[PDB]
Amino acid sequence: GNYKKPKLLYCSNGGHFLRILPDGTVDGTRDRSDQHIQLQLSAESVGEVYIKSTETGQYLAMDTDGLLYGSQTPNEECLFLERLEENHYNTYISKKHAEKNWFVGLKKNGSCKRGPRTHYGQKAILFLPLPVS
Amino acid sequence: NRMPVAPYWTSPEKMEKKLHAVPAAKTVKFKCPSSGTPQPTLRWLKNGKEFKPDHRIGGYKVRYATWSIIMDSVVPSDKGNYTCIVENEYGSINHTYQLDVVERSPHRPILQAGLPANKTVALGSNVEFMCKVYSDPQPHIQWLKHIEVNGSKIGPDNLPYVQILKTAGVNTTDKEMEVLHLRNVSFEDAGEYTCLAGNSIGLSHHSAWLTVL
């Protein structure tokens, strides 16, 4: 609702909520009561955002391998281009790896789907911004 | 005629995705594949009560061959819990899906009416400016000052001269940008202050004037 308020990023695939774990691991879950799925989004520029846990204050990031981890301090690997596609879902592409067209995604089981194996036609890249409750 | 068997799930896996959040107008399908002898029947509930096709515009499609229900063009009033009941003389099983229908705002930021309000104040006083924004895709806010370089306030492209005063970036906070605070306001600090809110779709802006005296 209010861009300043926390939200949960719901994947259209397994219907998972994106989750950043203290150990810096990011996977998925249906546990809508978890405390590591609450995300706060901030824009560095028009259409360019940061995503982070309002519990571990970690920033969602993606390394040169395509892995999504929880970084304690923001940086390039922490920026994503937020887009509201025409099907009305949100896609997030690595700012740093924009060219390799790596998207943020989760497998059906609910695990990171390394950017490289991600494709625009895919369904793991599609997220729906949801309210905490 | 055959040894009785209470209804059971033929495909549990395909049932774990309990919460179905989908953008408005999409098509939703819930499936509860089961079996048993005698062969079980199937019916659906919505938020507790019986769910007949007369309960939503255009009704819905049930394909028993696949123990599924299908609703085309989801709308907000479709939000709720969907429970399938499989029953035969020897038992009953059920599963409940939660359907959430999300509405998107594929538009530029909407700025709150009024803010930032125009002003004419007294020197040395600290003046604020509030800008409140509604935006689905994350917005970015920036405050600008209507410059008057040379004599013209309108630049060479018919676009008013400006100077960026405050920009949102990691830090600040969604709420720190929401306000432009001035210090010991002077005379030259006279003019129009503009708040620019832009998202991946477009930009919106509100102005307010401030005269010095």
Curated annotation (Swiss-Prot), chain A:
A motif (Nuclear localization signal) lies at residues 4-7. Transmembrane segments: none annotated. The keyword Cell membrane does not apply. Changing N13A: No effect on integrin-binding. It comes from the Eukaryota. CDD domains: beta-trefoil_FGF1 (cd23313). Heparin binds at N13. Changing S111A: Decrease in LRRC59-binding. Predominantly expressed in kidney and brain. Detected at much lower levels in heart and skeletal muscle. GO terms for cellular component: cell cortex; cytoplasm; cytosol; extracellular matrix; extracellular region; extracellular space; nucleoplasm; nucleus. Changing S94A: Decrease in LRRC59-binding. Signal peptide: none annotated. In the nucleus, phosphorylated by PKC/PRKCD. Keywords: Acetylation, Angiogenesis, Cytoplasm, Developmental protein, Differentiation, Growth factor, Heparin-binding, Mitogen, Nucleus, Phosphoprotein, Secreted. The keyword Manganese does not apply. GO terms for biological process: activation of protein kinase B activity; anatomical structure morphogenesis; angiogenesis; branch elongation involved in ureteric bud branching; cellular response to heat; epithelial cell proliferation; fibroblast growth factor receptor signaling pathway; lung development. Changing Y89A: No effect on integrin- and heparin-binding, loss of FGFR1-binding, defective in inducing FGF1 signaling, cell proliferation and cell migration. Residues 107-123 are annotated as: Heparin-binding. It is found in: Secreted; Cytoplasm; Cytoplasm, Cell cortex; Cytoplasm, Cytosol. GO terms for molecular function: fibroblast growth factor receptor binding; growth factor activity; heparin binding; integrin binding; S100 protein binding. Gene3D superfamilies: 2.80.10.50. Plays an important role in the regulation of cell survival, cell division, angiogenesis, cell differentiation and cell migration. Functions as a potent mitogen in vitro. Acts as a ligand for FGFR1 and integrins. Binds to FGFR1 in the presence of heparin leading to FGFR1 dimerization and activation via sequential autophosphorylation on tyrosine residues which act as docking sites for interacting proteins, leading to the activation of several signaling cascades. Binds to integrin ITGAV:ITGB3. Monomer. Homodimer. Interacts with FGFR1, FGFR2, FGFR3 and FGFR4. Affinity between fibroblast growth factors (FGFs) and their receptors is increased by heparan sulfate glycosaminoglycans that function as coreceptors. Found in a complex with FGFBP1, FGF1 and FGF2. Interacts with FGFBP1. Part of a Cu(2+)-dependent multiprotein aggregate containing FGF1, S100A13 and SYT1. Interacts with SYT1. Interacts with S100A13. Interacts with LRRC59. Interacts with CSNKA, CSNKB and FIBP. While binding with LRRC59, CSNKA and FIBP seem mutually exclusive, CSNKB and FIBP may cooperatively interact with FGF1. This is Fibroblast growth factor 1. It comes from Homo sapiens (Human).
UniProtKB/Swiss-Prot annotation, chain B:
It is found in: Cell membrane; Nucleus; Cytoplasm, Cytosol; Cytoplasmic vesicle. Autophosphorylated. Binding of FGF family members together with heparan sulfate proteoglycan or heparin promotes receptor dimerization and autophosphorylation on tyrosine residues. Autophosphorylation occurs in trans between the two FGFR molecules present in the dimer and proceeds in a highly ordered manner. Changing S200C: In HH2; also found in a family member with isolated anosmia. Residues 14-31 are annotated as: Heparin-binding. Changing I93T: In HH2; some patients also carry PROKR2 and GNRH1 mutations; impairs the tertiary folding resulting in incomplete glycosylation and reduced cell surface expression. Monomer. Homodimer after ligand binding. Interacts predominantly with FGF1 and FGF2, but can also interact with FGF3, FGF4, FGF5, FGF6, FGF8, FGF10, FGF19, FGF21, FGF22 and FGF23 (in vitro). Ligand specificity is determined by tissue-specific expression of isoforms, and differences in the third Ig-like domain are crucial for ligand specificity. Affinity for fibroblast growth factors (FGFs) is increased by heparan sulfate glycosaminoglycans that function as coreceptors. Likewise, KLB increases the affinity for FGF19, FGF21 and FGF23. The second and third Ig-like domains directly interact with fibroblast growth factors (FGF) and heparan sulfate proteoglycans. Isoforms lacking the first Ig-like domain have higher affinity for fibroblast growth factors (FGF) and heparan sulfate proteoglycans than isoforms with all three Ig-like domains. It is linked to Pfeiffer syndrome: A syndrome characterized by the association of craniosynostosis, broad and deviated thumbs and big toes, and partial syndactyly of the fingers and toes. Three subtypes are known: mild autosomal dominant form (type 1); cloverleaf skull, elbow ankylosis, early death, sporadic (type 2); craniosynostosis, early demise, sporadic (type 3). Hypogonadotropic hypogonadism 2 with or without anosmia: A disorder characterized by absent or incomplete sexual maturation by the age of 18 years, in conjunction with low levels of circulating gonadotropins and testosterone and no other abnormalities of the hypothalamic-pituitary axis. In some cases, it is associated with non-reproductive phenotypes, such as anosmia, cleft palate, and sensorineural hearing loss. Anosmia or hyposmia is related to the absence or hypoplasia of the olfactory bulbs and tracts. This is Fibroblast growth factor receptor 1. The lineage of its organism: Eukaryota, Metazoa, Chordata, Craniata, Vertebrata. The gene is FGFR1. The chain holds residues 147 to 359 of 822 of the full protein.
